[PDB]
Amino acid sequence: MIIPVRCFTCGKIVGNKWEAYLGLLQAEYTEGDALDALGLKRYCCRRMLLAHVDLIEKLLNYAPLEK
Amino acid sequence: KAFEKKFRFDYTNERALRRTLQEDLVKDVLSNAHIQNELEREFERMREDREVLRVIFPTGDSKVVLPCNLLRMIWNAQKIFHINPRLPSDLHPIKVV
Amino acid sequence: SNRPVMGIVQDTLTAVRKFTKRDVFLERGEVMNLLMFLSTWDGKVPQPAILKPRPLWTGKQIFSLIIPGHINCIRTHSTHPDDEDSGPYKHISPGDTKVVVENGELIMGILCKKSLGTSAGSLVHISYLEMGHDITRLFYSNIQ
Amino acid sequence: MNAPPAFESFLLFEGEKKITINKDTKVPNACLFTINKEDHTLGNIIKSQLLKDPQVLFAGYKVPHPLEHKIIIRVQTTPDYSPQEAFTNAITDLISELSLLEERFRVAIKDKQEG
Amino acid sequence: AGILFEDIFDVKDIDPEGKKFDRVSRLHCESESFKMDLILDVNIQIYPVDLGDKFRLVIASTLYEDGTLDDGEYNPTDDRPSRADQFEYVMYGKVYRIEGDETSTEAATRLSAYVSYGGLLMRLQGDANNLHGFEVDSRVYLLMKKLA
Amino acid sequence: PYANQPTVRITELTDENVKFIIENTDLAVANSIRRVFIAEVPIIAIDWVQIDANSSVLHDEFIAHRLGLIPLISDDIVDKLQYSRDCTCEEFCPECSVEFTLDVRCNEDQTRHVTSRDLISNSPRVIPVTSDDILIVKLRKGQELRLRAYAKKGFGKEHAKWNPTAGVAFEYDPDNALRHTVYPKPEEWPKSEYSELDEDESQAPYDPNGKPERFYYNVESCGSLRPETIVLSALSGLKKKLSDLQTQLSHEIQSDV
Ligand SMILES: [Zn+2]
Ligand SMILES: [Zn+2]
C-alpha cells in the first residue's frame, strides 16, 4: 500500500526515502544510481524501495466517505 | 564337505582341542566314549535338521524370520563376560548339548 | 514388517552423517555444549581421542555416549563398496564406511539411513529390542 | 489468541526466582543453575567465562526450549572449590571486564572526536 | 611401565587410494628392527606429517607409566602424576579385535592389531612375539614424536 | 581465571555509523555485546496510540503500527525515564512517558503527506529524528487525521520498534585462519574488507593454536540513539544485567546455605 518505514531485515529507516527515490527516478537516475544516492548499500534495504508498489495513490483516487 | 567341517566337532585332532578347549576338558572329552556318542548323536540330529530345511526351503533362501537373534546375543555374551577368543575356553561341549 | 517405524529422519539424519565422519573434531566447549543435551549422560566427560597437542574429541566418541547400555550392531554406510569385504582393509575401511558398534560404543563407520533409519536390523531396532522402549525413547530424543 | 505477551523473556512475574541452584547427584561437587526469563545473551557469557577458570572441569549453558525463557547452567569444578563460588567469580570477572571495556571505549571515543 | 609396544616407524605412503577426509590422512608405515607393518589414521592439520619421516610410535596402556590405571576420564588437573609428555602427538583409543594367521592346530606366528581411537583406526601387523600385549576391549594410548 | 584486557580502536565514527574493533577478548562476550546492540539497549518509541478521527484510507492500527516504528531521539532522556511497569503512577506520567499529538486535515485538493514533522511532542528533547520526512500516511482533499500517542521506554526484546540500531555488521577472523568455516573452493570467495592477506592467496594458513580475537564491528544507528551512545548503553545494560544476576545469586547462596 504505502512505503513501509523501517526496512524489515535490518531496520534502517526507508519510509522517508520513497518520494526522493521517485524524484530521482523521474529526473535522471536509474534505479541503481537512485538507490546508491539514497545511501542504501545493503540489498535488504534496496529491495524495499525497488520492489515497492504504491497503492496509496490508487486508494486516493476514490472520493472520501465524508467530503 | 563344508557342513561336516563346520558342524562335526572332530575330537580326534588332539591339537585343535588343546587350542580351543581347556586342558582339563580335553582328557574328559577323549577318554569317555559317552561324550563322543552324545556328540555324534547331536551331529546326526543336525544332519536330519539339514535335510528337513532343504525340504522346507528350496531355492536355497537362507534368510528367515525368527523370534530371537542368536548371533547378536552370542556377541552380547562375548562382550558382557569379556570373552577372549585368543585363549582356550572352559566350556564343556556336553554341557552345551 | 518387524521393523522400527520411527527413525532419525531429515535434518538430524543429515547432520548425523556429517557428524559421524572421521573428519569431525570437537573442541572442549563444543563438547560440553553437546554433552548437556544428552539427558541420559552420567556426568563423566570421556577422554578425548586426541590428547596432545590439544584435547580434541571426535563425533563418534561423543555419539557413543548416546547409544544406550551396551548395544552390539553391525551396519554398512550407503557409500560402502563391495570390494572392501573381499580384499584387505575389511575391518579398516579406508573410506570409513560400514558400521561397527561394540559394547554400546561407536567404534567406526558413518551413520546414515541404513543405520539410524527405519529398516530391519537398524541400530535403533537393536536398541529397541535389546534395551526396551523407554530407553530407546531417550536414545531418539538425545540423538535429535 | 495463544500468543504470549511480549514481556515474558525478561519480566519476572509473581512466584519465580531469578536463579535457582540444584546440586547434581551424578558427579561430586557439580551444581545446576536455573536462570528464569533469560536467554543466550548471558547463557553463553557465563559459559565462556567459566572455561577461563582452570579449576572448572565442566561448564556450559543450554536453553531447555526456545518457546520458554529459561537457562540451565551446569558447572563442575575440582574438589575443594564450590561451583557456586566459581559462578560468582565468573560474574564478577565479567563485570570487571565490561567496566574496563567501557572505560577504554570512552577513552577511544574521546581520542577520535577532536583528536 | 605399562608400555605395550615401542618402535620407530617410517612413512612409506600417505594416500594409496586417495584423500577421503581432508583433515585425516592414513599413514602407511613400515618399521625398522621389528619389521612392524603399520597403517594409522592421523589428524593432519593439527599434526602435519609427510612422506619419509622417522617418528617414534609408542603404545601404552597408561600415560602415567608408574603402573596405575587411568579410570578412563578426562581431567586436565591430572598433571601431578607426571604424565608421559615427551611425545608431540598423543591419542587415546580402544583395540576392537586381534587378527592372526593361526588355523586349528598351529599357533599364531603373526598378529594384527585393530585399535580405534574414537574413529581413527589403525592396523599393526607383525610377529606375535612382541604384539602379544594387546587384549581385545582394552584401553590403549598412542604416542607419536617426529625424529630428525 | 581472570579477565583478559580488551582494547578498542574506532576506525569510522559518523552521526549514523560507528566502526570499531575489539581485541584481546573472548568470542562469547563479543557476540553478547553484538546481541545487546539489538535487544537490550533502551530506547523511546511510541507504544500507546489513541485515534480520535481517522479519515485516511489506511485503517486505525495500520497508522498506529507506522507511528510505532517512527524513531525518536532518545540520546539523553532515555536513561532518566523509567519503564511504565516500574513507574509509581497509573497509566502514563511525564516521568514514565512522552506525549505525542498529531492533527492533520487536508483541505486543498492536492494530496497532503502526513509526515513525522506533523508529530508534536510535549518535551523538546524527543524529536522524531527531524533536526527527509518519514511518511505516515497520505491524505486526499476532505480526509482528516487526529490522534494522541504516548511514547514509552523499551528495548529490542519487547518489540522491533524498540530496536535502536540498523544492521549491526559483526565479523571476526576475516582471512579464515581458524577454519571455523571451510570453503569447498577458497579461490572463488571474495576477500573481506578487513582481509590482511595479499590478493594472490585465498586463505591464511591454518592456525591450530589460534582462538577468535579482533572482532570487527560496524554499528549503524537508526537515528534515534547516536551510534556511540548505542554501544555505551549496550555495555552499561549488559553490565547491569550481570550485576542483577550477581545480586540474585548472592541472595540465593545465602538463603540456601
Ligand atoms: Zn535493510
Ligand atoms: Zn508515570
Swiss-Prot record, chain A:
What GO molecular function annotation could you give as one example from this UniProt entry? zinc ion binding
Q: Which GO terms describe its cellular component?
A: cytosol; nucleoplasm; nucleus; RNA polymerase I complex; RNA polymerase II, core complex; RNA polymerase III complex
Q: Name one GO biological process term.
A: transcription by RNA polymerase I
Q: Which residues cross the membrane?
A: none
Where does it mainly reside?
Answer: nucleus
Q: From what superkingdom does this record's organism come?
A: Eukaryota
Binding sites annotated in the UniProt record for Zn(2+): C7, C10, C44, C45
Keywords carried by this UniProt record: DNA-directed RNA polymerase, Metal-binding, Nucleus, Transcription, Zinc
Q: Which family does it belong to?
A: Belongs to the archaeal Rpo10/eukaryotic RPB10 RNA polymerase subunit family.
Q: What does this protein do?
A: DNA-dependent RNA polymerase catalyzes the transcription of DNA into RNA using the four ribonucleoside triphosphates as substrates. Common component of RNA polymerases I, II and III which synthesize ribosomal RNA precursors, mRNA precursors and many functional non-coding RNAs, and a small RNAs, such as 5S rRNA and tRNAs, respectively.
Alphabetized HAMAP family for the sequence: RNApol_arch_Rpo10 (MF_00250)
Listed name of the protein: DNA-directed RNA polymerases I, II, and III subunit RPABC5
User: Which organism does this record belong to?
Assistant: Homo sapiens
UniProtKB/Swiss-Prot annotation, chain C:
Protein name (Swiss-Prot/TrEMBL) = DNA-directed RNA polymerase II subunit RPB1
| Protein source organism | Homo sapiens
Q: What is the effect of changing N2S?
A: In NEDHIB; uncertain significance; no effect on cell viability
Role, per record: Catalytic core component of RNA polymerase II (Pol II), a DNA-dependent RNA polymerase which synthesizes mRNA precursors and many functional non-coding RNAs using the four ribonucleoside triphosphates as substrates. Pol II-mediated transcription cycle proceeds through transcription initiation, transcription elongation and transcription termination stages. RNA-dependent RNA polymerase that catalyzes the extension of a non-coding RNA (ncRNA) at the 3'-end using the four ribonucleoside triphosphates as substrates. An internal ncRNA sequence near the 3'-end serves as a template in a single-round Pol II-mediated RNA polymerization reaction. May decrease the stability of ncRNAs that repress Pol II-mediated gene transcription.
Identify the disorder associated with this protein.
Neurodevelopmental disorder with hypotonia and variable intellectual and behavioral abnormalities: An autosomal dominant neurodevelopmental disorder characterized by profound infantile-onset hypotonia, developmental delay with poor speech, delayed walking, and impaired intellectual development. Additional variable features include feeding difficulties, dysmorphic features, and visual defects.
Domain of life from the UniProt record: Eukaryota
From Swiss-Prot, chain E:
**Main subcellular location of this protein, as a coarse class:** nucleus
PANTHER family noted in UniProt? DNA-DIRECTED RNA POLYMERASES I, II, AND III SUBUNIT RPABC3
The protein's job, in short, is:
DNA-dependent RNA polymerase catalyzes the transcription of DNA into RNA using the four ribonucleoside triphosphates as substrates. Common component of RNA polymerases I, II and III which synthesize ribosomal RNA precursors, mRNA precursors and many functional non-coding RNAs, and small RNAs, such as 5S rRNA and tRNAs, respectively.
Read off the SMART domains from this record.
Answer: RPOL8c
N-acetylalanine, modified sites: A1
Q: Which Pfam families match?
A: RNA_pol_Rpb8 (PF03870)
Q: Where do the segments described as Non-specific ssDNA binding lie?
A: 15-39
Its annotated compartments are:
Nucleus; Nucleus, Nucleolus
Q: Which InterPro entries match?
A: NA-bd_OB-fold, RPABC3
Q: Where does the UniProt annotation place the signal sequence?
A: none
This protein's name:
DNA-directed RNA polymerases I, II, and III subunit RPABC3
Q: Which UniProt keywords apply?
A: Acetylation, DNA-binding, DNA-directed RNA polymerase, Nucleus, Transcription
What is the similarity comment for this entry?
Answer: Belongs to the eukaryotic RPB8 RNA polymerase subunit family.
Q: What positions belong to coiled-coil segments?
A: none
Q: How does it assemble?
A: Component of the RNA polymerase I (Pol I), RNA polymerase II (Pol II) and RNA polymerase III (Pol III) complexes consisting of at least 13, 12 and 17 subunits, respectively. Pol I complex consists of a ten-subunit catalytic core composed of POLR1A/RPA1, POLR1B/RPA2, POLR1C/RPAC1, POLR1D/RPAC2, POLR1H/RPA12, POLR2E/RPABC1, POLR2F/RPABC2, POLR2H/RPABC3, POLR2K/RPABC4 and POLR2L/RPABC5; a mobile stalk subunit POLR1F/RPA43 protruding from the core and additional subunits homologous to general transcription factors POLR1E/RPA49 and POLR1G/RPA34.
Which residues are connected by disulfide bridges in this protein?
none
Cellular component per GO, a single term: nucleus
From Swiss-Prot, chain F:
Sorted alphabetically, which keywords does the UniProt record give? Answer: DNA-directed RNA polymerase, Nucleus, Phosphoprotein, Transcription
| NCBIfam families assigned | PRK00783.1
- Gene Ontology molecular function terms on file: DNA binding; DNA-directed RNA polymerase activity; protein dimerization activity
Q: What is this protein's function per UniProt?
A: Core component of RNA polymerase II (Pol II), a DNA-dependent RNA polymerase which synthesizes mRNA precursors and many functional non-coding RNAs using the four ribonucleoside triphosphates as substrates.
User: Which gene produces this protein?
Assistant: POLR2C
Naming one, the record's GO cellular component terms include: RNA polymerase II, core complex
Q: Where are the transmembrane segments?
A: none
Q: Where in the cell is it found?
A: Nucleus
Q: What is its main location?
A: nucleus
Phosphoserine occurs at S123, S243
For this entry, the protein name equals DNA-directed RNA polymerase II subunit RPB3
Q: Where is this region: Disordered?
A: 189-212
User: Which GO terms of type biological process are on file?
Assistant: transcription by RNA polymerase II
Which positions does UniProt annotate for Zn(2+) binding? C87, C89, C93, C96
Q: How does it assemble?
A: Component of the RNA polymerase II (Pol II) core complex consisting of 12 subunits: a ten-subunit catalytic core composed of POLR2A/RPB1, POLR2B/RPB2, POLR2C/RPB3, POLR2I/RPB9, POLR2J/RPB11, POLR2E/RPABC1, POLR2F/RPABC2, POLR2H/RPABC3, POLR2K/RPABC4 and POLR2L/RPABC5 and a mobile stalk composed of two subunits POLR2D/RPB4 and POLR2G/RPB7, protruding from the core and functioning primarily in transcription initiation. Part of Pol II(G) complex, in which Pol II core associates with an additional subunit POLR2M; unlike conventional Pol II, Pol II(G) functions as a transcriptional repressor.
CDD domains in the cross-refs: RNAP_II_RPB3
HAMAP family tied to this protein: RNApol_arch_Rpo3 (MF_00320)
Q: Which domain of life is it from?
A: Eukaryota
Keyword Cell cycle attached: no
Q: Does the keyword Magnesium apply?
A: no
Q: Which Pfam families match?
A: RNA_pol_A_bac, RNA_pol_L
The beginning of the lineage is: Eukaryota, Metazoa, Chordata, Craniata, Vertebrata
